[PDB]
A and B are shown apart, each in its own frame.
Chain A
């Protein structure tokens, strides 16, 4: 696993083309996330 950029705890990937896209985030320490909810689902076929 790589290191955060010096002086940073994470990386934000900000969308700079696709106007509808929300952000993605990267952490470099497993201890910086807690898996609070397990969601079981199916994707639905559009009508």
Chain B
């Protein structure tokens, strides 16, 4: 695939700033925890840096295109993504297979500023049937994975929504 995962030390300032963005963006959800579980904070077990030359050049190539269409402004964010297919994403990248066809803003790839929002999608749309082992959307035992992603927004269409 070309992808290597580098473990960050808990002593690394990079681990610490990523953990703080994960922990500080937890909120309560209108489903009372149905999709993602009941929690106020996480136990962070591991943070790995994702390194793929080909996927990175594909990103910076599209980022330059967007910035040249938007007065040299990529409008780049760091956002969370939750998916049962993180293993396919880190090896082959995002593509239409990672889109949600029935999403509120159409068939695209969805990202959240709230880590707890992305958490509702780790086990599928609306949490699916929850963890593989216990069929529990609020499992406190099974290990979950989120991506923290570099995302180019360029000129973003603003939708006011509930």
- Where chain B touches its partner, the secondary structure class is mixed
**Interface residues in B114-162 (C-beta closer than 8 Å to A):** 114, 117, 119, 138-162
Checking A17, A24, A38, A40 against B90 with a beta-carbon cut-off of 8 angstroms, the contacting residue is: A38
CB atoms of A42 and B59 under 8 A apart: no
B11 part of interface (Cβ distance < 8 Å): no
Which A residues lie within 8 Å of B95 (CB)?
30
Which B residues lie within 8 Å of A43 (CB)?
36-39, 42-43, 119, 138-140, 144
Checking A1, A4, A24 against B112 with a beta-carbon cut-off of 8 angstroms, the contacting residue is: A24
Binding site for A on B (CB under 8 A): 5, 18, 22, 25, 27-28, 30, 36-50, 55-56, 58-59, 61-63, 66, 69-70, 75, 77-79, 81, 86, 89-90, 93-96, 98-99, 103-114, 117, 119, 138-162
